[PDB]
Amino acid sequence: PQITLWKRPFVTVKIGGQITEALLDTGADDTIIENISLPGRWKPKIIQGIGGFLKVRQYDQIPIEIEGHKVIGSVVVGPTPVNVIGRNVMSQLGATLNF
Amino acid sequence: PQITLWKRPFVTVKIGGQITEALLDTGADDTIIENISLPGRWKPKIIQGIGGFLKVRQYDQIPIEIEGHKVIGSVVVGPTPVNVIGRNVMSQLGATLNF
Numbered sequence: 001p002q003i004t005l006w007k008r009p010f011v012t013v014k015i016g017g018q019i020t021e022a023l024l025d026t027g028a029d030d031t032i033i034e035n036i037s038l039p040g041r042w043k044p045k046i047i048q049g050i051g052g053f054l055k056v057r058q059y060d061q062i063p064i065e066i067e068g069h070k071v072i073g074s075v076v077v078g079p080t081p082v083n084v085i086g087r088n089v090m091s092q093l094g095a096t097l098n099f
Numbered sequence: 100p101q102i103t104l105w106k107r108p109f110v111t112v113k114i115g116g117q118i119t120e121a122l123l124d125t126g127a128d129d130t131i132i133e134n135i136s137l138p139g140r141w142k143p144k145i146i147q148g149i150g151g152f153l154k155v156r157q158y159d160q161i162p163i164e165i166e167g168h169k170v171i172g173s174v175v176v177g178p179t180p181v182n183v184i185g186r187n188v189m190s191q192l193g194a195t196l197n198f
């Protein structure tokens with residue numbers, strides 16, 4: 001797609017088989033999802049944001065399906081006001097910002 | 100431009116006459132800059148992101164120049180780990196995310 005930015009750029013995604021909605025976020029290095037549960041081992045990440053840091057779970061090697069594209073990536077699970085798809089996923093799509 | 104996303108999408112911007120560097124951030128509604136000083140009245144604001152909220156100041160009617168484009172927008176001044184250009188500016192450029 002070609003997505004305009006006069007509203008928040010939400011997309012439906014499937015992450016580890018779980019369908020959720022998330023914001024395409026070029027300011028996020030990582031993909032951060034609150035409302036999913038993933039199985040297995042994870043690595044504590046102190047993740048940083050505008051409000052401070054928090055301790056979360058980094059899960060690796062997760063299947064991610066977005067607008068027909070199928071990629072593998074790391075997914076951070078923890079509290080976030082909105083789920084975000086970061087550049088670790090968008091760069092695998094070849095996504096660009098255009099103006 | 101067409102900007103890829105395998106590194107952070109920083110651009111040089113002039114805000115209120117001040118040149119700084121900022122991240123093009125589709126997950127930011129607003130433009131948040133730490134290292135500038137703007138004159139005059141402002142509105143207190145609270146914004147929320149990963150890690151919680153933070154209190155900031157909102158200046159209106161600020162001239163913003165980015166890659167040859169000249170727009171007027173509101174600018175939030177306050178602590179942010181990275182300066183971000185949000186959709187309030189990018190939508191005025193007709194920017195799109197493409198993949």
Ligand SMILES: COc1ccc(S(=O)(=O)N(CC(C)C)C[C@@H](O)[C@H](Cc2ccccc2)NC(=O)O[C@H]2CO[C@H]3O[C@@H]4OCC[C@@H]4[C@H]32)cc1
Pocket residue numbers: 023025026027028029030031032047048049050051082084086124125126127128129130131146147148149179180181183185
């Ligand atoms: C209302 O208007 C707003 C309100 C909120 C924000 S924000 O900065 O909180 N944020 C909104 C988003 C959480 C829905 C914009 C994001 O693009 C921030 C922008 C941001 C960047 C860096 C630091 C703080 C904020 N990115 C961010 O929180 O990234 C996290 C996740 O991945 C990591 O990459 C980043 O780089 C390493 C740390 C962060 C981690 C901006 C304008």
Ligand SMILES: [Cl-]
Pocket residue numbers: 072073074088089
């Ligand atoms: Cl990844």
Ligand SMILES: [Cl-]
Pocket residue numbers: 171172173187188
């Ligand atoms: Cl504005």
